[PDB]
């Protein structure tokens, strides 16, 4: 008879006793057991085809993607411990600056800037949420999928801050059209069309590795530097302390997404040929990001410096992984 094991069969002989993280996150996708028939149905079903094409046939290759490990090691339970903490802080900010009358103290000029540069981000943030939720459902291993799950909730987290602050702003400045105008700004403002195009196009890159690169390595770095870093330093110097803080709080999420993307890239580099693959995908998309950052930041105050700073900080992210 087979003996009871110390740990899951797929983890035995690891020398170190498996962590909670390893216990609940590893080797969970079963569609990768039969690359020829992922799903327990006819093998010509459109979904069969979708997974064969966009997961299995990706040029980004590894013999064992299940070896991937979040460096932050997040599980649901600790994701909600972290994020409840960070939300007590942000909801705290909202409560107490309202109480203070913070929105009343902003200048008309700044209010106008918010309507143009800040509010419509609900579309860009929802579209990252879609972006990251797609990586989830197409990635080759559960630990990859998980990082993308928690990142998708952050993206919703940001959409949610923006939706909230948008009422408060409408409540305080009823004539501006906060909440009504954002769609036409997103759709028609030249400052947004760089990003809108970047994201619409990256949203239809189905290959898992090209989705990871286009969303996590290229679009995100560019959205983050432009909307969190640049608009936030601006916010602070124009007297918006709430958005300077809010934005820095969301950049905590972004730095975590960066740490796992970097770990993934690091793992992909163990295999000959992947750097070239990733570098190629970056070159295809970088020009759309450059355009995004140009069209957005150039319309800001001190526009050209914001472009130089955002360009180089977002490139830096990729440089640090060895790309």
Question: Which residues here bind a copy of itself, judged by CB under 8 A?
Answer: 84-86, 88-90, 92-93, 96, 99-100, 241, 245, 248-249
Residue 291 touches other proteins, criterion: CB under 8 A = no
For other proteins, the closer of residues 99 and 175 by Cβ is 99
For other proteins, the closer of residues 49 and 312 by Cβ is 49
The structure tokens listed for 143 are 């630990």
Torsion of CA 270, 274, 276, 277, to 10 degrees: -160
From CA 142, how far away is CA 55, in angstroms rounded? 13
Is the CB of residue 215 less than 8 Å from the CB of residue 129? no
Contacted by 249, from a copy of itself, other proteins, none: CB < 5 to 8 Å by type: a copy of itself
| Ramachandran bin of 16, using left for φ above 0, alpha for ψ from -120 to 50, beta for the remaining angles | beta
Tokens of 160: 């949610």
| 104 sits near other proteins (criterion: CB under 8 A) | no
Assess contact for 186 and 109: CB atoms under 8 A: no
The Cα 236–Cα 244 span in angstroms is 5
Separation of alpha carbons 274 and 59, rounded Å: 8
Site for other proteins in 159-218 (CB under 8 A): 159-160, 163-164, 166-168, 171, 179, 182-183, 186-187, 196-197, 200-201, 203-204
Query: Counting contacts by CB under 8 A, is residue 94 touching other proteins?
Result: yes
The helix or strand, by DSSP H or E, that contains position 259, with its residue range, turns out to be: helix 241-268
Q: Based on CB atoms, which residue is closest to other proteins, 204 or 283?
A: 204
Query: Which residues ranging from 63 to 82 are in contact with other proteins (CB under 8 A)?
Result: 75-77, 79-81
Q: How far is the CB of 257 from other proteins (least distance, A)?
A: 16
Half-sphere exposure (CA, 13 Å, Cβ side) for 152? Answer: 17
Binder among 61, 93, 110, 156 for other proteins (CB under 8 A)? 156
Q: Which is nearer to a copy of itself, 171 or 237 (CB)?
A: 237
Place of tokens 């730095």: 255
Contacting other proteins within 20-59 (CB under 8 A): 20, 23-25, 27-31, 33, 39-48, 50
Picked from other proteins, a copy of itself, none, the partner binding residue 89 (CB below 5 to 8 A depending on kind) is: a copy of itself
């Amino acid at each position: 008879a087979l003996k009871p094991l110390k740990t899951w069969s797929h983890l035995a002989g690891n020398r170190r006793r498996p962590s909670e993280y390893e216990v609940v996150s590893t080797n969970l996708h079963y569609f990768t057991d039969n690359p020829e028939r992922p799903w327990e149905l006819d093998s010509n079903l459109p979904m069969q085809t979708w997974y064969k094409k966009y997961c299995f046939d990706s040029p980004l290759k590894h013999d064992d993607w299940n070896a991937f490990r979040d460096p932050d090691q997040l599980v649901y339970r600790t994701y909600n411990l972290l994020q409840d903490g960070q939300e007590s802080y942000v909801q705290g900010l909202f409560d107490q600056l309202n109480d203070r009358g913070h929105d009343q103290m902003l200048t008309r000029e700044w209010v106008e800037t918010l309507a143009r540069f800040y509010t419509p981000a609900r579309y860009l943030f929802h579209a990252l949420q879609m972006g990251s939720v797609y990586i989830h459902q197409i990635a080759p291993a559960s630990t990859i999928t998980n990082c993308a799950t928690y990142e998708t909730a952050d993206h919703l987290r940001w959409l949610t801050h923006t939706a909230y602050r948008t009422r408060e702003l409408a409540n305080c400045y009823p004539d501006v059209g906060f909440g009504k105008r954002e769609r036409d700004v997103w759709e028609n403002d030249p400052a947004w069309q760089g990003f809108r195009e970047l994201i619409e196009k990256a949203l239809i890159a189905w290959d898992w590795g090209e989705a990871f690169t286009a969303i996590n390595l290229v679009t995100k770095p560019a959205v983050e530097e432009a909307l969190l870093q640049q608009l936030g330093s601006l916010a602070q110097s124009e007297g918006d302390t709430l958005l300077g803080l809010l934005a820095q709080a969301q950049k905590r999420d972004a730095e975590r997404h960066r740490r796992w993307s970097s770990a993934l890239v690091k793992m992909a580099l163990e295999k000959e040929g992947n750097r070239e693959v990733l570098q190629k995908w970056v070159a295809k998309w970088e020009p759309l990001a450059d355009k995004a950052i140009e069209a957005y930041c150039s319309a800001l105050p001190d526009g050209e410096n914001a472009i130089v700073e955002a360009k180089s900080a977002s490139r830096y992210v990729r440089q640090m992984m060895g790309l």
